[PDB]
């Protein structure tokens, strides 16, 4: 409602680096809200694209941004009789960043990994990794939960059970309020998906620079289901956390499997033990129900109402039998005796191939009226196809039917504006949360300050 776009602030990264692919705020020790922006294609030290993370300080003028000095160099270690080998090449270090208020958990899902024992190897694959970094103390810490070392001759002899080599862990990462780190590995157990929950304080404590294979010993991965619905589910493709089971100590994950049950897609809710609480099947196939999950109380009832993006949902019209516009669901968590799972609201896009719903951002109380207000984005919506960000306030029974205000992209066509948003973080202390939109196609990030 109040995200006046006349005077933005544009943060720009190296040209050709997708600067803005994934972003999140980071409150420093002084309360100086600095923007973390992930650029999965920034050139490294070998003239190769190996990601990079740009901790943007909040400047009312935007511009360039100093990067976070991370490890972009391939590391090899002859531990035991195995050639432990990491290939930090095309790893996309920044494909999904997140900050636990002093730690920048910037992940690299496509970071390969290979171990050799004199004839054979683990079939080098993107096990992914998540480089952690405190901007104040500057102590790096890696965390790759899926760096196995079982030879490929054993996986083929176990019907690929516990085949967490393809994890791409850090594909979608969220850090709980208590301090855990919840990676989304939508390749774990052979593209069936998993999660890794290792507390942040227990990653710094148990990280020795130099050894590649190590188990945190406090982590907890998901389980390899054998239900043919789960196969090729890309489970954990986009995860979020909330409170869906009463115990305020534990937290509940909102894992979204977009290709679930033969492309139908379902967003599962599950407690800290990965035991399924809820499961929200999608309407129609090939719509990525669950490509982008979000969780916020959109009706001020104390319940964590989740939202599920369906970027490729094909609505029904009178001209096109099914014209692909996208759809954002709203599963209000019932405060009564019934259960979550009935879609309370169905927000649908307007522009064909706009992928309306590929990135939802719980801005929180944007206009200070009690109820939180998400902001959906269509990376190719609008009347021209340069992107669009729509702000849906939530009145009392869920969200508003019509978007309060749209944010037409100020970047040229192809910028994919809206591919990554973040909200509910006041970046200059107007008292109001300020939405920042990641236009990775134009290698920039736009900051929309919410003037009251």
């Amino acid at each position, epitope marked *: 409602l109040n995200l006046d776009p006349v005077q933005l602030t544009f943060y720009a990264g190296p040209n050709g680096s997708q600067f803005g692919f994934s972003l999140d705020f980071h409150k420093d020790s002084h309360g100086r809200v600095a923007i973390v922006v992930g650029a999965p294609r920034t050139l490294g030290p070998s003239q190769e694209e190996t990601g990079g993370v740009f901790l943007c300080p909040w400047r009312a003028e935007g511009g360039q941004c100093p990067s976070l000095l991370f490890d972009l160099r391939d590391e090899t270690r002859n531990v035991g009789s195995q050639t432990l080998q990491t290939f930090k090449a095309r790893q996309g270090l920044g494909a999904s960043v997140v900050s636990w208020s002093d730690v920048i958990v910037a992940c690299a899902p496509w970071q390969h990994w290979n171990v050799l024992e004199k004839t054979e190897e683990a079939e080098k694959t993107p096990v992914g990794s998540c480089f952690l970094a405190q901007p104040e103390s500057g102590r790096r810490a890696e965390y790759s939960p899926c760096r196995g070392n079982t030879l490929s001759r054993i996986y083929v002899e176990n019907d690929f059970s516990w085949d967490k080599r393809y994890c791409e862990a850090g594909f979608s990462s969220v850090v709980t309020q208590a301090g855990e780190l919840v990676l989304g590995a939508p390749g774990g157990y052979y593209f069936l998906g998993l999660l890794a929950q290792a507390p942040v304080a227990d990653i710094f404590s148990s990280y020795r620079p130099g050894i590649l294979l190590w188990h945190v010993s406090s982590q907890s991965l998901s389980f390899d289901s054998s239900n043919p619905e789960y196969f090729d589910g890309y489970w954990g493709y986009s995860v979020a956390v909330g409170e*869906f*089971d*009463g115990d305020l100590n534990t937290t509940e994950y909102v894992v979204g499997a977009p290709t679930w049950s033969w492309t139908l897609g379902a967003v599962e809710i599950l407690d800290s033990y990965y035991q*399924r*609480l*809820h*499961r929200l099947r999608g309407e129609q196939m090939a719509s990525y129900f669950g490509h982008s999950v979000a969780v916020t109380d959109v009706n*001020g*009832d*104390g319940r964590h109402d989740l939202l599920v993006g369906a970027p490729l949902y094909m609505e029904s019209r009178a001209d096109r039998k099914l014209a692909e516009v996208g759809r954002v669901y709203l599963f209000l968590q*019932p*405060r*009564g*005796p*019934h*259960a979550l*799972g009935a879609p309370s609201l169905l927000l649908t896009g307007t522009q064909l191939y706009g992928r309306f719903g590929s990135a939802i951002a719980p801005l929180g109380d944007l206009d200070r009226d009690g109820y939180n207000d998400i902001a959906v984005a269509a990376p190719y919506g609008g009347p021209s196809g340069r992107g669009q960000v729509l702000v849906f306030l939530g009145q009392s029974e869920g969200l508003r039917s019509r978007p309060s205000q749209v944010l037409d992209s100020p970047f040229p066509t192809g910028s994919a504006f809206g591919f990554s948003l973040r909200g509910a973080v006041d970046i200059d202390d107007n008292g109001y949360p300020d939405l920042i939109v990641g236009a990775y196609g134009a290698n920039q990030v736009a900051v929309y300050r919410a003037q009251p």
Partner: antibody
Amino acid sequence: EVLLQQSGPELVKPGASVKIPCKTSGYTFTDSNMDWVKQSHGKSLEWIGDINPNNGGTLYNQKFKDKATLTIDKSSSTAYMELRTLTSEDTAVYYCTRSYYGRFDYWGQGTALTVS
Amino acid sequence: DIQMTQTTSSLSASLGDRVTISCRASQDISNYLNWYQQKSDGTVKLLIYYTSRLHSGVPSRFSGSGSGTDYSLTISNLEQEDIATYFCQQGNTLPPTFGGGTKLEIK
């Protein structure tokens, strides 16, 4: 420790209403709803109506929807169900349960009702 | 609505033993199914919820192994304090309908 300590046994002439108060202690009141369940003589219990402490929600069973005017006292952490037009067939025990994430955790006592 | 049925309305076995309270759902629900222990003279409390989640103030003997429509409560080491009427509640779709109630008897 939260106890939903309810009222005592009542007796009502037929055709006259009756009020069943359910006090809540501990447990800041507006965290969860305050449902209601009627247990008949055959010890088969079916629930009556929901109500939302923040704002009167009054979600009913569509079988008791008429004669279960559910009320609430947010300030005094109390909850009512004000049964109306009572008949001889609706003499039962009326629990004052609490919903909390779609369960009925905590019920408390149970108000014996009698119609003569 | 959804009609919940407990076939055996009166189950019986010796103390210190395991018994399984059955419960069926007319319409296929998910894994939403609570369990309530009601002993003599009221004082009904909540057992395992969501078909297996022990409540805060309940022993660790109770456990449920239901999925789909066929739900159960397999109580282990039946003590003297576990004789009660056990009601299964569906809590998926309004209105949540309880079960028929299984009377327990120590033998």
